[model samples]
Target: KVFGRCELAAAMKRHGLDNYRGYSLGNWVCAAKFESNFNTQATNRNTDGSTDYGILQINSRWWCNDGRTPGSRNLCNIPCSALLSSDITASVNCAKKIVSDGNGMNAWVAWRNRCKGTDVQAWIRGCRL
Candidate 1:
């Protein structure tokens, strides 16, 4: 499912992404904007052969089982396909797991390159939160 900016903001906030791990809702919104353009089914294959799946682009290498990544850990114990679903609950929970992993949101390169250390209020601006 594709999402409008405020729609995504509302959804993420509803999922408790706001202030999750000390990262505000805008930070999560900003990362999702660049990670998957707010699309639930988005996927990307990395050069290293791991797959990124879903709105947050959770990786197959260490988080989910894709049945193809060599030595994949399934650390999140979720199916990679779960992240691709239109419902963001699984993806949002996985997102929290990623943050709580101690690597924080920087585990997502888009967040590090575009959202981290940036003023993310614009990402959720005009939303009636």
Candidate 2:
């Protein structure tokens, strides 16, 4: 889908990010690809009545803190379901904040090296985006 770049930018700003140029975006995309193929609709039910939701796979039950009881609030300002709407760029930027807190892209590098099975130097060399 057409991930809204402007929305992403706004979301990033909301999270106190100034620059978006880094391997972080690339790494997040790669991780999302690996985890759910960028499927915003992806969800998984847990045994404890919790559920993972959306592109970043944020667990709604845990994140929402109200057990799927609609109209609930989260520390992030919105519930996970509302947060998971097709506004992917915003979702992506939100995910970036969740993962890295608008700092350098090292979190992405760490994620790639640890979770996505990418060799650190080689991955850096290959990151042309």
Candidate 3:
């Protein structure tokens, strides 16, 4: 499922991503935009054979078990397929766990290269979050 900008913002806020760990709501919304274009089913295969799944693009090599990624840690103890579900409650929880590891949103390359140090406030400015 594809989510609108405001819709995704609201959902993230509802899931407690608003300023989580000192990262603002805009940070998450912007990362989702750059990472997956707000598509719940988005997936990307890395050159190293790792797969990134879902809106936040959780990686198979470290986070989810996709069976194909070598040295899979399944740190989140979830299947990569589960991250693609339209219901993103699980994805959000996994995302929180990811940031809890001390990296914050920096766990996502997309967020670091694109979302960080930018004026992401515009991403959620018009939303009712």
Candidate 4:
């Protein structure tokens, strides 16, 4: 399911990710935009054979299980399919866990490559949040 920018912003705020772990809402918004373009069902296969899941592109290598990927740690204790849903509660929760692991937003390559140092304000522009 794809969400509008404003809707995604509201969802992030509702999940306390507007300023999660000292990262601004713009950071998360930018990361999500590049990661999945607000598509909850987004999935991408990596060169390492693991797949990125959800708007945040949480990976199966150390996150959730998609059943196809072998030896998945499933550290989030949830199925990978659970992240690919319109209700992003599971994705948000798992993302918090990932951020708390000390990687911050660096866990996402998109954030490091594109969102970082960029004009992140544009991500939240026109959003009522």
Q: What is the overall TM-score of model 3 with all chains considered together?
A: 0.96
Instruction: Single out the weakest 10-residue window by summed lDDT for candidate 1.
Output: 70-79
TM-score of each: 0.97, 0.53, 0.96, 0.95
Candidate 4 stretches with Cα past 4 Å from truth are: none
**Steric clashes per prediction:** 0, 0, 0, 0
Question: Which lDDT tens digits does candidate 3 get at residues 1-77?
Answer: 99999999989988998888888989999999999999999999999999999999999988899999887799888
* Highest TM-score against the true fold, candidate: 1
Model 2 residue runs over 4 Å out of place are 1-23, 65-73, 100-129
lDDT against true structure, model 3: 0.91
| Deviation of model 2 at 128, angstroms | 9.7
- Candidate 1 local lDDT, 27-112, one digit each (tens): 99899999999999999999999999999999998899999999878988899999998889999988888899988888989999
Runs of candidate 1 with Cα error greater than 4 angstroms are: none
lDDT (CA) per prediction = 0.92, 0.49, 0.91, 0.91
Off by over 4 Å in 3: none
1 or 2, greater by TM-score:
1
Which candidate model has the greater lDDT, 2 or 4? 4
RMSD of each candidate relative to the true structure:
0.8, 6.5, 0.9, 1.0
